[PDB]
Amino acid sequence: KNIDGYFKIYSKHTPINLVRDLPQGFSALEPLVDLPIGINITRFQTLL
Amino acid sequence: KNKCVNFNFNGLTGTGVLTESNKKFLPFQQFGRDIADTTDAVRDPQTL
Ligand SMILES: *[C@@H]1O[C@H](CO)[C@@H](O)[C@H](O)[C@H]1NC(C)=O
């Protein structure tokens, strides 16, 4: 999320045993970085 | 430690008795708060 041009990243890695979808359960995402880029971002894309 | 002192951490000024804590701060976490929005535990800017 980009709040006032600061790129905050919250990340979390958990194991699962499934191939279908997002599992039922609860887990929180610890903050990772702040990138003070100041960029208006409106579209994105992932890279495989 | 164990003495009532005027402590100043990164501008987080106050007065209290700094003791050894058994809280488990996450690596990013810097300081704690009390229900009254007052600091209860801090991370020393020099010694983590
Ligand atoms: C400087 O701060 C770092 C932060 O962890 C600490 O490891 C180091 O011992 C400090 N050195 C001096 C000379 O204050």
Curated annotation (Swiss-Prot), chain A:
Organism domain of life: Viruses
Consequence recorded when altering A28V: In strain: 20A.EU1
Effect noted on mutating D21G: In strain: Beta/B.1.351
Sites where a glycan is attached: N40
The protein's assembly and partners: Binds to host ACE2. RBD also interacts with the N-linked glycan on 'Asn-90' of ACE2. Cleavage of S generates a polybasic C-terminal sequence on S1 that binds to host Neuropilin-1 (NRP1) and Neuropilin-2 (NRP2) receptors. Interacts with host integrin alpha-5/beta-1 (ITGA5:ITGB1) and with ACE2 in complex with integrin alpha-5/beta-1 (ITGA5:ITGB1). May interact via cytoplasmic c-terminus with M protein. May interact (via N-terminus) with host bilirubin and biliverdin, thereby preventing antibody binding to the SARS-CoV-2 spike NTD via an allosteric mechanism.
Function, in words: Attaches the virion to the cell membrane by interacting with host receptor, initiating the infection. The major receptor is host ACE2. When S2/S2' has been cleaved, binding to the receptor triggers direct fusion at the cell membrane. When S2/S2' has not been cleaved, binding to the receptor results in internalization of the virus by endocytosis using host TFRC and GRM2 and leading to fusion of the virion membrane with the host endosomal membrane. Alternatively, may use NRP1/NRP2 and integrin as entry receptors.
UniProt name for this protein: Spike protein S1
Record gene name: S
Boundaries of the shown chain within the full protein: 195 to 242 of 1273
UniProtKB/Swiss-Prot annotation, chain B:
Source taxon at top rank: Viruses
The protein's role, per its UniProt record: Attaches the virion to the cell membrane by interacting with host receptor, initiating the infection. The major receptor is host ACE2. When S2/S2' has been cleaved, binding to the receptor triggers direct fusion at the cell membrane. When S2/S2' has not been cleaved, binding to the receptor results in internalization of the virus by endocytosis using host TFRC and GRM2 and leading to fusion of the virion membrane with the host endosomal membrane. Alternatively, may use NRP1/NRP2 and integrin as entry receptors.
Oligomeric form and interacting partners: Binds to host ACE2. RBD also interacts with the N-linked glycan on 'Asn-90' of ACE2. Cleavage of S generates a polybasic C-terminal sequence on S1 that binds to host Neuropilin-1 (NRP1) and Neuropilin-2 (NRP2) receptors. Interacts with host integrin alpha-5/beta-1 (ITGA5:ITGB1) and with ACE2 in complex with integrin alpha-5/beta-1 (ITGA5:ITGB1). May interact via cytoplasmic c-terminus with M protein. May interact (via N-terminus) with host bilirubin and biliverdin, thereby preventing antibody binding to the SARS-CoV-2 spike NTD via an allosteric mechanism.
UniProt protein name: Spike protein S1
Organism of derivation: Severe acute respiratory syndrome coronavirus 2
First-to-last residue of the parent protein present: 535 to 582 of 1273
